[PDB]
């Protein structure tokens, strides 16, 4: 059934699972036309498909040509997501295929179920958690590869950098969701916190800065402060 606070350690057990977030698949800018009407222009998007135990992120870039001449794009985007996730599963060796796929938005349930009919033993599950994966396009290197794409493309990253050498998956996921929650809440401040100190760099092959354990505790505290601040600001407290 639904994944929530009660069954949270299940994310880090040894049954392969993937989260799928479709928030950033269909992305538009809204603008005025010469006649004063409103129109949209699509920009490139992406499917965010993440193994929370390993940090493996299958980032399928959705190029705007996908939408050409199609109607009801927000509906189509859910089905295109499900088609691409099904294709990914089929491309993986049997021993790497997930036993569960958790969708971050319940509207993905039926599209994904229908596309996965050939996999009756893969459970398709919603979640009660409000996960901040929409903020993935606030990670500079992810946003850059999506915007530069000239055609459909899959790009493979570990979203945890090398953190699993020093911390458990549970702690890595908690750090990731904190960072993303902060970036979603106040992107400018969050990115300031992450880059304030010019001596800490991001390795070429990483997404996040190379913090020591002590610096990560400081950083994490700064992100909590930001989230609480923005909370009071937005809510006056």
């Amino acid at each position: 059934g639904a994944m929530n606070s009660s069954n949270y350690a299940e994310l880090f057990n040894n049954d392969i699972k993937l989260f799928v977030d479709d928030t950033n698949v269909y992305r538009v800018t809204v603008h005025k036309t010469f006649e004063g009407n409103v129109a949209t222009k699509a920009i490139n998007g992406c499917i965010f498909t993440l193994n929370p135990k390993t940090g493996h992120l299958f980032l399928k870039i959705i190029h705007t040509s996908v939408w050409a001449g199609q109607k009801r794009l927000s509906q189509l985007a859910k089905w295109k997501t499900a088609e691409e996730v099904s294709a990914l599963v089929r491309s993986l060796p049997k021993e790497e295929q997930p036993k569960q796929i958790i969708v971050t938005r319940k509207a993905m349930l039926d599209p994904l179920e229908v596309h996965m009919l050939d996999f009756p033993n893969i459970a398709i599950r919603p979640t009660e958690l409000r996960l901040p994966f929409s903020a993935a396009m606030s990670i500079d290197k992810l946003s850059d590869v999506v915007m530069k794409a000239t055609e459909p493309q899959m790009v493979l990253f570990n979203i945890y950098d090398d953190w699993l050498d020093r911390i458990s998956s549970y702690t890595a996921f908690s750090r990731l969701t904190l960072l993303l929650r902060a970036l979603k809440t106040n992107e400018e401040s969050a990115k300031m916190i992450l880059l304030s100190d010019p001596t800490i760099t991001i390795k070429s092959y990483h997404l996040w800065p190379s913090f020591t354990d002590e610096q990560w505790i400081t950083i994490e505290s700064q992100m909590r402060d930001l989230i609480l601040t923005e909370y009071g600001r937005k809510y006056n407290v």
Binding site: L76, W79, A82, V114, L117
Partner: protein, 300 residues
């Protein structure tokens, strides 16, 4: 006009014949039902006064044999049986008629209700849904589960309705996932009509039989089937015009007949709201929408 005699009525029971019903008291001298219209299937059904648990009954067609009812004190129910001795049967019937110990099928001449509820229902198709090949009539009760309910447990006592499942490989062509899920026309027209049912008359016959079993016996599984068969048509963008017009008539008479006090459980709010107001066919069921809005505006 044909007759279903009763050997006796040893227990107090409400007896239904099609849409009619009457109470019989314990050991009241009741000996059956005469003047049953030839040309239609019929159902004779029972609810005991002392245990309303289990409504049960028998579907039959008097053109296929001479049938009578006899109470069995061991199994505790009224059983239909076939009399093979034609002279014995005509003699029995004539004597009970002479003593006026039978009720008359009370059909108003103006009244087409039973025809309209059974237009496509054939005994031969009933006998494939309800499998008991040694009898010419078919037993149905409240508890009997469907093949589809079983998949999700005695097979010989099951209602073998055609399985309809919108999230199934049968319903969804590889490569047309979104198309087939959002527009069920290929599942309706190719899989079900051309493939399984062969024609729309057989589809409507099963739809009508499912409704009647839901209404007369409170068979939950029959209720699910009726709604699935409606939803499959309404959720298809391409349906022959004669089928839509006939469906509108079929449903109109079903909604007209449904007891007002049973609508809360026999009418699925989601299916009916989707069918009348959201589906491809939201504008094709004028008679059904009008009666639903005047009779059950709450559900909607």
């Amino acid at each position: 006009m044909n007759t279903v005699p009763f050997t006796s009525a040893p227990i107090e029971v409400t007896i239904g014949i099609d849409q009619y019903s009457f109470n019989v008291k314990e050991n009241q001298p009741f000996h059956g039902i005469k003047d049953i219209p030839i040309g239609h299937v019929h159902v004779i059904h029972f609810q005991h006064a002392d245990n309303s648990s289990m409504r049960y009954g028998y579907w039959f067609d008097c053109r296929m044999g001479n049938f009578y009812i006899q109470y069995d004190p061991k199994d505790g129910l009224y059983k239909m049986m076939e009399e093979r001795d034609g002279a014995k049967f005509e003699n029995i019937v004539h004597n009970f008629k002479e003593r006026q110990m039978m009720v008359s099928y009370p059909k108003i001449d103006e009244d087409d209700t039973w025809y309209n509820l059974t237009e496509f229902v054939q005994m031969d198709k009933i006998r494939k849904i309800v499998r008991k090949d040694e009898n010419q009539f078919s037993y149905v009760d409240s508890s009997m589960t469907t093949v589809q309910e079983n998949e999700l447990s005695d097979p010989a006592h099951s209602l073998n309705y055609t399985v309809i499942n919108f999230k199934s490989r049968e319903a969804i062509r590889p490569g047309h996932e979104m198309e087939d899920f959002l527009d069920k026309s290929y599942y309706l027209n190719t899989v079900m009509l051309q493939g399984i049912f062969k024609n729309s008359s057989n589809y409507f016959g099963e739809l009508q039989f499912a409704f009647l079993n839901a209404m007369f016996f409170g068979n939950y599984g029959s209720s699910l089937q009726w709604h699935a068969m409606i939803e499959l048509i309404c959720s298809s963008a391409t349906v022959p015009k004669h089928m839509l017009d006939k469906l509108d008539e079929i449903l109109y008479y079903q909604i007209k007949t449904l007891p007002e006090q049973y609508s809360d459980i026999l009418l699925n709010e989601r299916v009916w709201n989707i069918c009348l107001y959201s589906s491809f066919q939201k504008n094709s069921l004028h008679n059904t929408e009008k009666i639903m809005e005047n009779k059950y505006p709450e559900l909607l």
